[PDB]
Each structure stands twice: as structure tokens, then as C-alpha cells.
Amino acid sequence: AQNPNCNIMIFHPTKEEFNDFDKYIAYMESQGAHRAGLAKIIPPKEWKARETYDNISEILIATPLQQVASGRAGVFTQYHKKKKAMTVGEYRHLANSKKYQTPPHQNFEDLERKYWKNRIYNSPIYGADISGSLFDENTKQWNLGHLGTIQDLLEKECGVVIEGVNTPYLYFGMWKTTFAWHTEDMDLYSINYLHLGEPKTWYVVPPEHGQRLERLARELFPGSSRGCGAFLRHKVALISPTVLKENGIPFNRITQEAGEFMVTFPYGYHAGFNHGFNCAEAINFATPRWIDYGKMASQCSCGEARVTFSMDAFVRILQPERYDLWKRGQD
Ligand SMILES: O=C(O)CNC(=O)C(=O)O
Numbered sequence: 001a002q003n004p005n006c007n008i009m010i011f012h013p014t015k016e017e018f019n020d021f022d023k024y025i026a027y028m029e030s031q032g033a034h035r036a037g038l039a040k041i042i043p044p045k046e047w048k049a050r051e052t053y054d055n056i057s058e059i060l061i062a063t064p065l066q067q068v069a070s071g072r073a074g075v076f077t078q079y080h081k082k083k084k085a086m087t088v089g090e091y092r093h094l095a096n097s098k099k100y101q102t103p104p105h106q107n108f109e110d111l112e113r114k115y116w117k118n119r120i121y122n123s124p125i126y127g128a129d130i131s132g133s134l135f136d137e138n139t140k141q142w143n144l145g146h147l148g149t150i151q152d153l154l155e156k157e158c159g160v161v162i163e164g165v166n167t168p169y170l171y172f173g174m175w176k177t178t179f180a181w182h183t184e185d186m187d188l189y190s191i192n193y194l195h196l197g198e199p200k201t202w203y204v205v206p207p208e209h210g211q212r213l214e215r216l217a218r219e220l221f222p223g224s225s226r227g228c229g230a231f232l233r234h235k236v237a238l239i240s241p242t243v244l245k246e247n248g249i250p251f252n253r254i255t256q257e258a259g260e261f262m263v264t265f266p267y268g269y270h271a272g273f274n275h276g277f278n279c280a281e282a283i284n285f286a287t288p289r290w291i292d293y294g295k296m297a298s299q300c301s302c303g304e305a306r307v308t309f310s311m312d313a314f315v316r317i318l319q320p321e322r323y324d325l326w327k328r329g330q331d
């Protein structure tokens, strides 16, 4: 069995190996990459996402989210308070202000310590979940706006034609902006490209141990657990690496820098934070190996998780018994 300790693997494809996306994902899995839940891919040195980022400041963040924390430093929830629209140029200036900028630090480890110690005492503003792409249309390799769609994968594997579309999303981050512990909708893959700016630190639980994290989360967030049998789908709970270690939960960590891709694998729980002003782009995708995970994925039916149009068909075809109750949640 490849990668039995479920370590995060880092890949360096050549320009020739960068042509066929599906084939390279299948290669990484042949080496055990999926067992970690997360892999890093460093693009060939010849590749570029686009020529420059000099002209992005007029993108609108229509609903910036202020991430307000509750709890203790290592075990907290966050809620998202909607703020007035601002441009990317306005947001970058805000990120760089004395109130919100990254503090002085020695290295990534010192910054990680400061994040866990101090996150809860601040409310950073995240420009998340913005439909759009920063890949140049002429970039032919690993262009997240040109991937094969999940609807087409389901059709190729299972023969059923379904409605829905699959497009990327932009994330504009600042110091302390946070992504809570989650897997993807329908336990899909995700791919994330850090276009510019400061790094993003990731934490991940191997898929084979995902239920250990769920059981800890039910203990740590007991009212949330009673409210919903899949409350990590709400994407609100944080648990520190210190707490995870104290409770014996297997995980790994890695820092993504500008110019690098990360891939999350089906049912790989992940969480993390931004080091400073940055812009990432991400999209979900599927492979043949996903289908069985999609069939088994938990669902939030309490009504909180409220998700895309395209998830309807996935539930309806892969999870027909759940369909009824899940749609009551969505309506
Ligand atoms: O970058 C973020 O805020 C969150 N991204 C993801 O969870 C992902 O790419 O799967």
C-alpha cells in the first residue's frame, strides 16, 4: 500500500506531464497521495496562470464576510457577518491597515503560534465565494475554468444526463481569515490555486480517519451535534492542532505559497488560515473513484448548510432515499 502513514505529498510535474489533468490526478493516487487527504502540486517553471495581476483591483466583493469567533482559543465557532460591498483594491488596502495586517513574526511557525493564540480576539474580513476566474483563457494547462465538469463525469461513469453547471470561485483573504473544518459538498475533490499574495496554511485529516474527527467534533460542540447529524457541513467549527494532538486525531499540516496548487481528496477534512492579503481560486471536481464517496456522503438536512443548484441532481441520482428529506432542508 502506497503512502501508508498518509503524509501529504508534493509533486513537481514536468510541462509534458502537465498536459493531461485527469491522468496526473490518477498518477498521484497511484503513489498514495489521496491517503493524506491533501496534496501540493508545484507547476512546471514554464507555466503561468496569467501574465500579470496588475489589473484586478476593480473586481467587486459584493458581500465581504466578517468572521466573528466564539469559544476558546483552540475550540471555537465562527459566524459570518455580512458587510457592505467593496472592490478588491479597497479590500487590499483594508487588509494592509494597521488594524488588520499580519504582525511581525520570525517565520511560518511563529505566525502559526500567533494565529492559534490570538485568532479569537479579532474579526478579520474574508472575500469568499465569488464566482469568477483569474486564469487567462489562453492558459491551456490546469486552467480551473476549463476542467471537465462533474455532471459530465457522472454521465460518463453512470450514463445519466443531469442539469447543473460547475464553475470556479475566488477567495480574497487577509491575516487570520479562516476556513473551518469541512469536506467538500458530496465529498468531492477540490483544487485550489493561490494566485497571489501571502501564504495559506492547511490542516488535513486522512480520509480513512475522518470519522475520528467527527466523533471529536460531536464531543466538543455538543449542542451543534444535537441540532444536526452533519453539522460540520455548516462550515463553522475550528479545532486547533494542539487540541487534535491531545485527543489523538491523526492529521497533517502544510503551507501553500503563491503559485502553487493544492488538491483535496474525497472525504479529506480540511481547515486553515491566511497569512495576509491573498487571492485564491478553487473549484470542485470528480473522478471515477469519487462516485462511491458521493453515494455515502453525509448530508445536512437541518436547513443550515444551504448549497448550490447543482448539488440537487447529485443527491437525487446518488442518494435517492435521502432526496426527499434533504430537499425539505433546502426548501
Ligand atoms: O481557501 C479557502 O478559504 C477554502 N478552500 C477550500 O476549502 C478548498 O479549496 O477546498
Ligand SMILES: [Mg+2]
Residues within 6 Å of the ligand: 055, 056, 057, 058, 059
Ligand atoms: Mg479589475
Ligand code: NI
Residues within 6 Å of the ligand: 182, 183, 184, 190, 264, 270
Ligand atoms: Ni474545501
Ligand SMILES: [Zn+2]
Residues within 6 Å of the ligand: 227, 228, 229, 230, 231, 233, 234, 300, 301, 302, 303, 304, 305
Ligand atoms: Zn445542518
